[PDB]
């Protein structure tokens, strides 16, 4: 009943657009590995664009004024917040469904997570165009926890590589098992390829 979307390889606003409408239709969404979101346009371009946003502050009392979140998760949240009617009750309710993470923490680090191919960089950009990792961007504008988020993700990838190896090992045995058994599953296996699987 819940989207989990690996924000890696996606485009910041392009993903946010799609997430907003999901969120407005009552879909609970989770967006994970937000540092891996990447924004079209060469790096420097986007840094300035952020740095400008930093300059925007309520002169008389900055403490009130537009809160510039550094973490890539909160950045991505900010851009999704910009596509909902978030002053309404229904808008505020909508955001409460969305759940964003720098990196990929423990509920979702053992969940299969989708990819919006309509927000994906490999598709939506020309290959000769330039872009920025929202991590780097976040890092240079003051995000504290890049390295921590990297050190925790190397653990995760090592932990996962193990799971995959065991998964592969079952798949392989299952391929062997069928071959071991294929005269006493033969007139089942035949019927599952008259109606068109197994081919």
């Amino acid at each position: 009943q819940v989207l989990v979307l690996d924000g890696r390889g996606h485009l910041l606003g392009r993903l946010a657009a799609i997430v907003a409408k999901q969120v407005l239709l009552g879909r609970k969404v989770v967006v994970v590995r937000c540092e891996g979101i990447n924004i079209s346009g060469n790096f420097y371009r986007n840094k300035l664009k952020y740095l400008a946003f930093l300059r925007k502050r309520m002169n008389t009392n900055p403490s009130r004024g537009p809160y510039h979140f550094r973490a890539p998760s909160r950045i991505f949240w900010r851009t999704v917040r910009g596509m909902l009617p978030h002053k309404t009750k229904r808008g505020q309710a909508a955001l409460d469904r969305l759940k964003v993470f720098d990196g990929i923490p423990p509920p979702y680090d053992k969940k299969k997570r989708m990819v919006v191919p309509a927000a994906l960089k490999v598709v939506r950009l020309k290959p000769t165009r330039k872009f920025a990792y929202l991590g780097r961007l976040a890092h240079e504008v003051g995000w504290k926890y890049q390295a921590v988020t990297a050190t925790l993700e190397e653990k995760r990838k090592e932990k996962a590589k193990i799971h995959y190896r065991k998964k592969k090992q079952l798949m392989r045995l299952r391929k062997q098992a069928e071959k071991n058994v294929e005269k006493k599953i033969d007139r089942f296996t035949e019927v599952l390829k008259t109606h068109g699987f197994l081919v």
Binding site: L173, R174, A177, E178, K184, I185, F188, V191, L192
Partner: peptide, 19 residues
């Protein structure tokens, strides 16, 4: 089909466990 798979996946599942 469902009935054919229900069985056909049971047989394999055991043979995997034996393996």
């Amino acid at each position: 089909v469902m009935k054919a798979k229900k069985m056909r996946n049971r047989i394999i599942k055991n043979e995997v466990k034996k393996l």
